Protein backbone atom coordinates (compact mmCIF):
# COMPACT_ATOMS: atom_id res chain seq x y z
CA UNK A 1 0.00 0.00 0.00
CA UNK A 2 1.18 3.51 -0.83
CA UNK A 3 0.18 5.86 1.99
CA UNK A 4 -0.88 9.46 1.64
CA UNK A 5 1.16 11.91 3.73
CA UNK A 6 -1.59 12.75 6.21
CA UNK A 7 -3.02 9.22 6.12
CA UNK A 8 0.31 7.85 7.37
CA UNK A 9 0.71 10.59 9.98
CA UNK A 10 -2.69 9.65 11.41
CA UNK A 11 -1.82 5.95 11.40
CA UNK A 12 1.53 6.51 13.13
CA UNK A 13 -0.07 8.77 15.73
CA UNK A 14 -2.72 6.15 16.48
CA UNK A 15 0.10 3.65 17.03
CA UNK A 16 1.86 5.86 19.58
CA UNK A 17 4.79 7.18 17.53
CA UNK A 18 4.12 10.88 18.12
CA UNK A 19 6.76 12.07 20.59
CA UNK A 20 7.90 8.48 21.14
CA UNK A 21 11.32 8.76 22.78
CA UNK A 22 11.15 12.50 22.14
CA UNK A 23 10.67 12.29 18.37
CA UNK A 24 7.77 14.37 17.06
CA UNK A 25 5.42 12.89 14.44
CA UNK A 26 7.01 14.92 11.65
CA UNK A 27 10.26 13.03 12.15
CA UNK A 28 8.65 9.65 11.51
CA UNK A 29 6.72 10.83 8.44
CA UNK A 30 9.87 12.40 7.00
CA UNK A 31 11.84 9.19 7.57
CA UNK A 32 9.14 7.08 5.90
CA UNK A 33 8.99 9.41 2.89
CA UNK A 34 12.70 9.17 2.11
CA UNK A 35 13.15 5.54 3.13
CA UNK A 36 10.27 4.04 1.13
CA UNK A 37 8.33 6.91 -0.45
CA UNK A 38 5.43 5.78 1.77
CA UNK A 39 5.31 2.34 0.10
CA UNK A 40 4.79 -0.56 2.53
CA UNK A 41 6.10 -3.02 -0.08
CA UNK A 42 9.49 -1.37 -0.58
CA UNK A 43 12.55 -3.64 -0.41
CA UNK A 44 16.22 -2.87 -1.02
CA UNK A 45 19.25 -5.18 -0.93
CA UNK A 46 22.46 -4.07 0.80
CA UNK A 47 26.05 -4.89 -0.14
CA UNK A 48 26.51 -7.11 2.94
CA UNK A 49 23.72 -9.40 1.75
CA UNK A 50 21.07 -8.10 4.14
CA UNK A 51 17.79 -6.56 2.94
CA UNK A 52 15.73 -3.57 4.13
CA UNK A 53 11.95 -4.02 4.37
CA UNK A 54 8.83 -1.89 4.41
CA UNK A 55 7.75 1.64 5.13
CA UNK A 56 10.71 2.21 7.47
CA UNK A 57 13.22 -0.02 5.67
CA UNK A 58 14.09 -2.21 8.64
CA UNK A 59 17.24 -4.27 8.06
CA UNK A 60 17.35 -8.08 8.19
CA UNK A 61 20.87 -8.09 9.65
CA UNK A 62 19.51 -7.39 13.13
CA UNK A 63 15.74 -6.91 13.24
CA UNK A 64 13.81 -9.53 11.26
CA UNK A 65 14.26 -12.96 9.74
CA UNK A 66 14.14 -13.39 5.96
CA UNK A 67 15.90 -16.75 5.89
CA UNK A 68 18.72 -15.51 3.68
CA UNK A 69 20.90 -13.29 5.89
CA UNK A 70 23.54 -15.65 7.40
CA UNK A 71 24.46 -15.11 11.04
CA UNK A 72 21.90 -12.36 11.51
CA UNK A 73 19.69 -11.54 14.48
CA UNK A 74 15.90 -11.34 14.64
CA UNK A 75 15.59 -8.79 17.45
CA UNK A 76 11.98 -7.93 16.62
CA UNK A 77 11.13 -11.64 16.47
CA UNK A 78 9.21 -11.36 13.24
CA UNK A 79 9.50 -12.56 9.63
CA UNK A 80 10.65 -9.66 7.46
CA UNK A 81 7.65 -10.23 5.16
CA UNK A 82 5.40 -9.05 8.02
CA UNK A 83 6.94 -5.59 7.59
CA UNK A 84 5.51 -5.30 4.07
CA UNK A 85 1.87 -5.50 5.19
CA UNK A 86 -0.66 -2.74 4.50
CA UNK A 87 -1.14 -2.74 8.29
CA UNK A 88 1.86 -0.87 9.72
CA UNK A 89 1.54 -2.29 13.24
CA UNK A 90 4.49 -4.68 12.84
CA UNK A 91 6.77 -1.98 11.41
CA UNK A 92 5.80 0.46 14.15
CA UNK A 93 6.35 -1.99 17.01
CA UNK A 94 9.77 -2.92 15.64
CA UNK A 95 10.73 0.72 15.04
CA UNK A 96 9.97 1.45 18.70
CA UNK A 97 12.55 -1.15 19.73
CA UNK A 98 15.07 0.21 17.23
CA UNK A 99 14.78 3.86 18.31
CA UNK A 100 15.22 2.81 21.95
CA UNK A 101 18.46 0.99 21.07
CA UNK A 102 20.59 3.95 22.11
CA UNK A 103 21.30 5.76 18.85
CA UNK A 104 17.79 7.14 18.41
CA UNK A 105 16.57 7.83 14.90
CA UNK A 106 20.17 8.01 13.67
CA UNK A 107 19.71 4.30 12.92
CA UNK A 108 17.85 5.47 9.80
CA UNK A 109 20.42 6.88 7.39
CA UNK A 110 17.80 8.78 5.38
CA UNK A 111 16.52 10.46 8.54
CA UNK A 112 20.05 11.52 9.51
CA UNK A 113 20.88 12.93 6.09
CA UNK A 114 17.53 14.35 5.03
CA UNK A 115 15.30 15.01 8.06
CA UNK A 116 17.54 15.68 11.04
CA UNK A 117 17.88 19.41 11.66
CA UNK A 118 15.15 20.37 9.19
CA UNK A 119 11.66 21.74 9.76
CA UNK A 120 10.01 18.33 10.15
CA UNK A 121 6.73 19.84 11.37
CA UNK A 122 6.15 20.68 7.71
CA UNK A 123 5.45 16.98 7.11
CA UNK A 124 2.23 17.03 9.15
CA UNK A 125 1.01 20.53 8.30
CA UNK A 126 -2.55 20.74 7.02
CA UNK A 127 -3.31 17.27 8.37
CA UNK A 128 -6.36 16.57 10.50
CA UNK A 129 -4.85 14.92 13.58
Annotated binding site for substrate: 101
Window 61-90: contact mask with Na ion (x via CB under 5 A) = ----x---x--x-x----------------
Q: Which of 18, 93, 104, 127 binds Cl ion (CB under 5 A)?
A: 104
Closest residue by Cα to residue 85 from 54, 45, 56 = 54
Distances (CA, A) of 90 to 84, 113, 121: 9, 25, 25
Please spell the DSSP secondary structure of 14-80, one letter per residue: HTT-TTBTTB-HHHHHHHHHHHHTTBTT-EEE-TTS-EEETTTTEETTTT-B-S-STT---TT-SBG
Residue number of the CB closest to Cl ion reads 104
**Contact pick of 36, 40, 60, 91 for Na ion (by CB under 5 A):** 60
Q: Which of 35, 48, 66, 87 is catalytic?
A: 35
Nearest one of 18, 21, 23, 48 to 111, comparing CA atoms: 23
Which residues make up each annotated binding site?
101
Size, binding site for Cl ion by CB under 5 A: 1
Name the one range near Cl ion by CB under 5 A: 2-10, 12-20, 50-58, 101-109: 101-109
CB of 19 to Cl ion, least distance (A): 12
Nearer to Cl ion, 79 or 104 (CB): 104
Handedness of CA 31, 65, 42, 12 (dihedral sign): negative
Active site residue 35: yes
Which parts of this chain interact with Cl ion (CB under 5 A)? 104
Active site residues: 35, 52
Amino acid sequence: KVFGRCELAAAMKRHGLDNYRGYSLGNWVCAAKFESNFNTQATNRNTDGSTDYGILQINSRWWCNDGRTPGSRNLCNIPCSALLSSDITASVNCAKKIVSDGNGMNAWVAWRNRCKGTDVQAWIRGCRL
